[PDB]
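Priority: low. Protein: Insulin-degrading enzyme. Input follows.
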Amino acid sequence: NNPAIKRIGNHITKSPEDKREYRGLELANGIKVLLISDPTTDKSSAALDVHIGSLSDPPNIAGLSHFLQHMLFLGTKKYPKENEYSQFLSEHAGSSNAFTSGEHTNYYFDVSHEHLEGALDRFAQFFLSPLFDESAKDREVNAVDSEHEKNVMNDAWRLFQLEKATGNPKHPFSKFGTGNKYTLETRPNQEGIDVRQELLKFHSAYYSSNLMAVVVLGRESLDDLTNLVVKLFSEVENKNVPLPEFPEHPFQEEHLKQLYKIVPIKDIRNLYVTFPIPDLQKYYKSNPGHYLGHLIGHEGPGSLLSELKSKGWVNTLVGGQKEGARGFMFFIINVDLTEEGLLHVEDIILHMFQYIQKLRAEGPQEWVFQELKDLNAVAFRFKDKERPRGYTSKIAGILHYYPLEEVLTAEYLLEEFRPDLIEMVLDKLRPENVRVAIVSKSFEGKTDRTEEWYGTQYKQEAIPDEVIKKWQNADLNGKFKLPTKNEFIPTNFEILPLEKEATPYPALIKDTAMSKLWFKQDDKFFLPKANLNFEFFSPFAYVDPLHSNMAYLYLELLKDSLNEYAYAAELAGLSYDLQNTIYGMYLSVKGYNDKQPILLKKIIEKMATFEIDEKRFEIIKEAYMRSLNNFRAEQPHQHAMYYLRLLMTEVAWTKDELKEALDDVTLPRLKAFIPQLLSRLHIEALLHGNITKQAALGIMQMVEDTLIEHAHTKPLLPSQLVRYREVQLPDRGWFVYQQRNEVHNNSGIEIYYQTDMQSTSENMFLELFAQIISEPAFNTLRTKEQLGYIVFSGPRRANGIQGLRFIIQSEKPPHYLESRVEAFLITMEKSIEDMTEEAFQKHIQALAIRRLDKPKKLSAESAKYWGEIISQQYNFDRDNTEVAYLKTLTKEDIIKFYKEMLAVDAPRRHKVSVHVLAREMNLSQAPALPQPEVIQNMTEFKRGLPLFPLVKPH
Ligand SMILES: [Zn+2]
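Result:
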C-alpha cells in the first residue's frame, strides 16, 4: 500500500474521443484529487477548490473569505516575496485567477508544461503558510474596494444583492460577499479587530484538507502526477470541519407572495418571477429541474415565450432552476418587457401559470426525457477538448459533488426517468409561493426603501389575495402545446476520410467577383462538426448613421423572425451568429455538420425574402433606442476604449449620431434598404471542419444562388472592397481627449503609444516589450500603488497599425494616472537595463510558448484563420515565422525600440490619451510632461492628420 493515499478510484468514465488519461484518488488527509495526463498539452494546469465561501464569512466582517482569496497570492512562508507567484507564472507563460462564491473558493493556474512542478510548489503554499503581510493587507483592501465600486452601478449585481436583502435577514444568504474598505478595514479598526489575525483564524479554521479538491493536468504520466500531488498536498492538515449546510430556505412564508418594484440604472424593463424549491442537486441522474426548465424555457412553437411575444408583451425569456446553496435552490421565469408588457405584468404571470397548468395536465413525458438524454449523450461523446485552465478549475468544483468515477460524466449523462420528482417540483410552482420583481424607470420617485450595499431604490408590497386567486384558477389556454420531436437532432456522425489534396492551412479554392472561399478539412480534431464563416461586403451597411441603424435593425428583425425555428437547431448543437459590421454583415454557422446545410439555407433564404412584421419592427426599434442610450451607463474604462476607437479609425459613427438618425427609420425606409443592401455584395468565407472540398464548394454556391435567385445580387467592384485606415499621429505629439461618465464615480483612462504598421519585426518588438512589462505593470500600478482593480497593459492592433496601450479605472484623476504610467515606463527602462541575459531569454521563451500554444478545438483554430482573413493579412503560418524572428532579438534591440518609440523624450513617440472623469470630478519619480493638445472635435482632429496606408497581404 501507500500511507498517504486513502483510496485510488476505479476507471474514470471519459468520452471515447478523449485521448487524455485520468486517475482519481483521495489522499489520507481527505483531499479529493483528479489527475489528468496529456502528453500533447503545451500548458499544464492545476486548480484547488475549498468548499467554503462567503456564506461562512463572520457576521461582523463581510467579505472576509473573498479578501483571503486575494491575500493568498501575496506571499507565503516558503515563497515570501509578494509577487513570487505571479512573476514565476508570467516568466513561464502562465496565468492565474481565483473566485469566491457562497460555498467555494476556487484557485487555478496554467503554465508552460516544463514548469508544472515549480508552479505547483508555489501554489501549494497558499494552502499551508500564507503570510498575510500587514503591509500587503493594507494595500490590497483597496483592490477589493475598487472591485465593489465597479459593481455598484451594475444592474445585475444590484439585483443579485437585492434578492438577498429581501429574504430572511438572519439567514447567511443575506450576507454581502464582495466586502469593501468599510467592511474590511474601517469598521474592523473601529471595533478593535486585528484583520491579519482574522485572516489567519479563518484560514486555520476552514482551509482544511477534508474540504478540498485538487486537479492537476500535465504531460507527466499518471504515476508521476500521483507522486507530485502526494509530495505537495499531503501536509495540508485535516481539521475535520463539518461541511456547512443550509436546510432552511431563506424565503419563508413572510417572504412569499411579495412584489418588488425596483429602479434600475440602465433604462431596462424586466420581470423576475421566482419560486423557492428544495435542493435538487442530489437528483442529478434524473435532473427534474432541467426537464422543467427545458419545457418552461422553450422557444419553439406552442411555447410560453411564443405566446407572450405574439401578444407583444415580451421579447425574451429564461426559465429553470437556479443554484442557492447546500439545502435550497430556486426556480425562475424571467422576461424582458415591452412598454405594453410593463402594463400587463398580471396577465403575463397568468399565462406563466396557464403554461405550468398545461404541464400538470399532460403529465411527465418520457419521450422528452429521452430527447434530453440523447442530446446530452451526443454532447458528451463529442465534447470539444477544453483549455487546461478552465478544465481543472471546473473539475475541482465538481469533485465535491460526485463520485470520483463519475466526475467527467455526471453533469451530462441522464439515467433515471423520475415522473415523481418532475411532479414534486411542479407542485412548488404555484401562486402561493411566488416572488415577483418588476424593474423599471417608471418607479422613480415612487420607492421608499434603499438596499444598504448598493443603494438600490425599491418598494415592497403584498400581492393582493384576489391576484393570487386569479393565478390559482389558471386554466388551459389553447395556445400552449408541448414542443414536438426535435428533427435537428443529428444522426450522422461519420468522419470523412482526409482527402489526398488536404492542406495544413486553409486553401483559396474559389476566387471570383462574387466570392472568395477559404477551405480546410479538419486534420486534427476529428469530431463531426464544422464552422462556416461568411463576411458579406456592402458599402451600404455603414455609409451613414441611418444606414448603419438599418443594417442592425434588419438583422435583429431577421433573428427575431427565425427564433422559433432556430431554437430547435440550437438545442441540437447547431447554432449561428448574425450581425452587421462596419463593412457589411457577418454570419457564422457552427456545430454538428449533419443538418448544418439545412439551417444555413434557411437563413440565406430568409435574409433574401424577408417581410418585416410592423409590430416587431416598433418593438425592436424602441429596444434599440434604449440600448444606445444605455451606453451612458457603461463603465468609465469601456467609455475610454470606445472614444479611442472613434478617434483613431477613419470612419466611425458615434452612439449620439446613430441615436439622432434613429427617429428617421421608418418601415417604408427599412423595406427599401434591404434589396438595396443585398443588390451588390462580395462574400468571403472560411469553411473549416468535417467537410470535403466539394461540399464546401457546394455550400458556397448555394449561398450565392439563393441570393442571386431571390435578391438579384451582383458582384461588387474590387475597388469598393474598402478597408478603413488608422489615423497617423505625428512624431512627438501628445493629444488628450476628455469626457465625463455621468453614472459611475470612478474615472477611466486609456493611453495609447502608437508605434507603426504591423509587420514581423514591429510585431515582435511590441509583443516582447509587452510580455516584459506585463506582470510588473500589474504589480506596480495595482498591487503596490493600488490605483484600481482594473489595470491593464498590452498591444493594441487595429486597421493594420499597432501600439502599446494602458487601461486603468480608478478613483484618482486621470492626470494623476498618466503620471504614474509614465513613472512606471521609466522603472521598466531601468529593469530592462538591469536584467540578466537569461532573464531576458526567459521572456522570449515565455512569449514563444504563448504564441505557439496549439488550439485544442475546431473553433479556436477557425478563429486564428478567420483573424488572418478579416484583417486581410492572410498570414496562416505567422506563428512559426514570428517566433523564429522573436528568438533573434537582443536586449539592445528592445532598449533601442523603447528609446525610439516609447520613452518620454522619444523622437517617434505618438501618444493619445482618453481621460474619462468620474461623475463628481515611497513612489518612483514621474518625469515632467509636455503640454498636450486637447482634442475639441473628433472630426477636426481626424481631418488635420494623415492616414496610414493599409497592410499588404501574404
Ligand atoms: Zn476579488
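The radius of gyration is 29 Å. The chain has four domains: 1-243, 244-473, 500-726, 727-954.
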